[PDB]
Amino acid sequence: SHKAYMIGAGIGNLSAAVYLIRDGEWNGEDITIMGLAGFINRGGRMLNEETYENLWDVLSAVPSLDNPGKSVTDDILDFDHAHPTHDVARLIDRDGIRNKGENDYKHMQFDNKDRYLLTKLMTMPESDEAKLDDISIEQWFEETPHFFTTNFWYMWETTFAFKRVSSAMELRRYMNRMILEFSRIQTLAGVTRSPYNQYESIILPMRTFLEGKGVKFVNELKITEFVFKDTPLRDEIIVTGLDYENVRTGEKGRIDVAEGDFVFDTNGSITDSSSIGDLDTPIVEDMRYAPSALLWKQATEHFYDLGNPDKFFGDRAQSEWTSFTVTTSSHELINEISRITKQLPGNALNTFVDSNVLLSIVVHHQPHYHAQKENEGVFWGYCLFPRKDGDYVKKPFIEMTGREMLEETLGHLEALDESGTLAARRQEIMDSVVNSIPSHMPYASALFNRRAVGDRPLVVPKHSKNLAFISQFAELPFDMVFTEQYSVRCAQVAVYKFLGIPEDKLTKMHHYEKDPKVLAKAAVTMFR
Numbered sequence: 001s002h003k004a005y006m007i008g009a010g011i012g013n014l015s016a017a018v019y020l021i022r023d024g025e026w027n028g029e030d031i032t033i034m035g036l037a038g039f040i041n042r043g044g045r046m047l048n049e050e051t052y053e054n055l056w057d058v059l060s061a062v063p064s065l066d067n068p069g070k071s072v073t074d075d076i077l078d079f080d081h082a083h084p085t086h087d088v089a090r091l092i093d094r095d096g097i098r099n100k101g102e103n104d105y106k107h108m109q110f111d112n113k114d115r116y117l118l119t120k121l122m123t124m125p126e127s128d129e130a131k132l133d134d135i136s137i138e139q140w141f142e143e144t145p146h147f148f149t150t151n152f153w154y155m156w157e158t159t160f161a162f163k164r165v166s167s168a169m170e171l172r173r174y175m176n177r178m179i180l181e182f183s184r185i186q187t188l189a190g191v192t193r194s195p196y197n198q199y200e201s202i203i204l205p206m207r208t209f210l211e212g213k214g215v216k217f218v219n220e221l222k223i224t225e226f227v228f229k230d231t232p233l234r235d236e237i238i239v240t241g242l243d244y245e246n247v248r249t250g251e252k253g254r255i256d257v258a259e260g261d262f263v264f265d266t267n268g269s270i271t272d273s274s275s276i277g278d279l280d281t282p283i284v285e286d287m288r289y290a291p292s293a294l295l296w297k298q299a300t301e302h303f304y305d306l307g308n309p310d311k312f313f314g315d316r317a318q319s320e321w322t323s324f325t326v327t328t329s330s331h332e333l334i335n336e337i338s339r340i341t342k343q344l345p346g347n348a349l350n351t352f353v354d355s356n357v358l359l360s361i362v363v364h365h366q367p368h369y370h371a372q373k374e375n376e377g378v379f380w381g382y383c384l385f386p387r388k389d390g391d392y393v394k395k396p397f398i399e400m401t402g403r404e405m406l407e408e409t410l411g412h413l414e415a416l417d418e419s420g421t422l423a424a425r426r427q428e429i430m431d432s433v434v435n436s437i438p439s440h441m442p443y444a445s446a447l448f449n450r451r452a453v454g455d456r457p458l459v460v461p462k463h464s465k466n467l468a469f470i471s472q473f474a475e476l477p478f479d480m481v482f483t484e485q486y487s488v489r490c491a492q493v494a495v496y497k498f499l500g501i502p503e504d505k506l507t508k509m510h511h512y513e514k515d516p517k518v519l520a521k522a523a524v525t526m527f528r
């Protein structure tokens with residue numbers, strides 16, 4: 001019987017397994033998936049019910065582990081509909097919340113130059129994307145630096161963790177795929193949240209369902225090299241073996257990939273080489289090159305049409321940022337944040353636009369984890385300039401302990417709090433801390449690095465017989481690479497191609513950017 005081998009266990013390969021089982025009528029036994037106090041916020045943070053067509057469809061076949069008779073899609077949408085989002089303190093500067101006045105976050109704050117360039121970028125056809133090769137956002141708006149002082153830039157860069165040195169291609173894809181969210185970017189009312197963090201709300205329901213269908217899960221094997229069959233013209237990609245190392249025993253070997261078996265590789269991950277600290281210990285930067293990209297980099301030693309992984313994993317300056325998760329033993333700290341920001345938990349992130357490190361925090365709906373106790377509260381924060389000094393803790397953010405990161409956050413919170421109450425309650429706040437876990441990710445935004453078309457392999461390269469790339473570093477049209485939808489889409493493309501399902505059966509994506517009314521509203525929104 002035909003077999004499938006997944007290298008990486010993220011949502012992309014899991015969705016491939018789902019597609020194989022549901023639409024290809026495979027047996028789970030034929031699929032092998034190979035991966036490797038206080039909470040840590042792992043996983044994707046957003047979704048969008050108007051987009052993510054593939055994700056909702058895959059997740060409509062995974063049962064909820066919490067609610068009998070509900071699919072994971074049902075869980076997620078039922079929750080979100082009952083917890084609508086309206087960000088209030090989206091932007092916070094040294095004077096207060098940009099809720100009102102001249103800097104009101106309803107104002108994009110665009111030039112006429114800013115709208116001209118932004119409209120040119122937005123209206124460039126998909127077929128012309130290569131014209132943007134290696135052009136950063138900084139470069140495309142080189143003539144109008146005023147852009148990088150607007151509300152829109154502050155909101156857009158922090159919403160997705162984009163840098164100005166990053167690829168202008170995605171900003172274009174945003175303005176087309178996410179066009180509907182343009183008019184509501186400041187309230188983030190279009191964001192769709194799952195009840196808990198997505199590892200618990202999405203990943204484990206998926207693994208459980210797959211495990212129940214027979215899929216084999218392996219986590220001791222480091223796949224070390226592809227083994228390709230040679231051909232006279234050397235175009236075809238035919239994987240014949242997977243060289244492995246067992247990281248616990250030390251055994252090495254080769255798994256034979258027979259004729260009719262398929263291989264799914266996740267060529268790179270935004271969490272590769274990440275490291276962790278705790279309340280009193282700063283991170284130690286893992287200097288190793290992205291381990292999940294090594295199979296990819298090695299295949300380029302044999303084939304010429306597979307891209308340049310160094311574009312994505314060779315420039316940490318483009319890709320790195322740092323986050324942290326706070327756990328408290330009482331609701332007090334969350335109550336204080338909720339009061340100072342004029343916002344109930346679960347209403348999207350709050351960005352301190354005048355902070356030196358560009359710090360944002362997110363307070364989720366509580367609880368965010370299944371093992372969260374009734375008395376416990378959790379929130380999450382990150383900065384986009386981890387090398388810069390903190391405003392209140394005057395050392396580089398990336399060198400801070402988890403405590404120091406909270407202290408730097410409180411400083412900004414206290415600065416916005418006129419009552420002075422939070423600062424007064426400092427000792428009690430800190431005593432309530434279970435942990436504050438810093439989390440450094442050198443490739444966190446590597447999927448946004450400056451890129452040229454062709455720097456990423458096709459999901460199924462033009463002459464690949466049985467190798468597919470399912471990742472945020474494979475080439476797919478239209479979709480935003482930030483979204484979990486991207487990897488789910490790669491999976492359907494790969495599975496349907498390998499199985500012979502024609503592309504008109506692929507899941508149909510919404511094209512709001514060709515509805516004239518949508519464009520009209522988008523055009524008007526430019527002047528808001």
Ligand SMILES: [Mg+2]
Nearest residue numbers: 049190191192
């Ligand atoms: Mg919605």
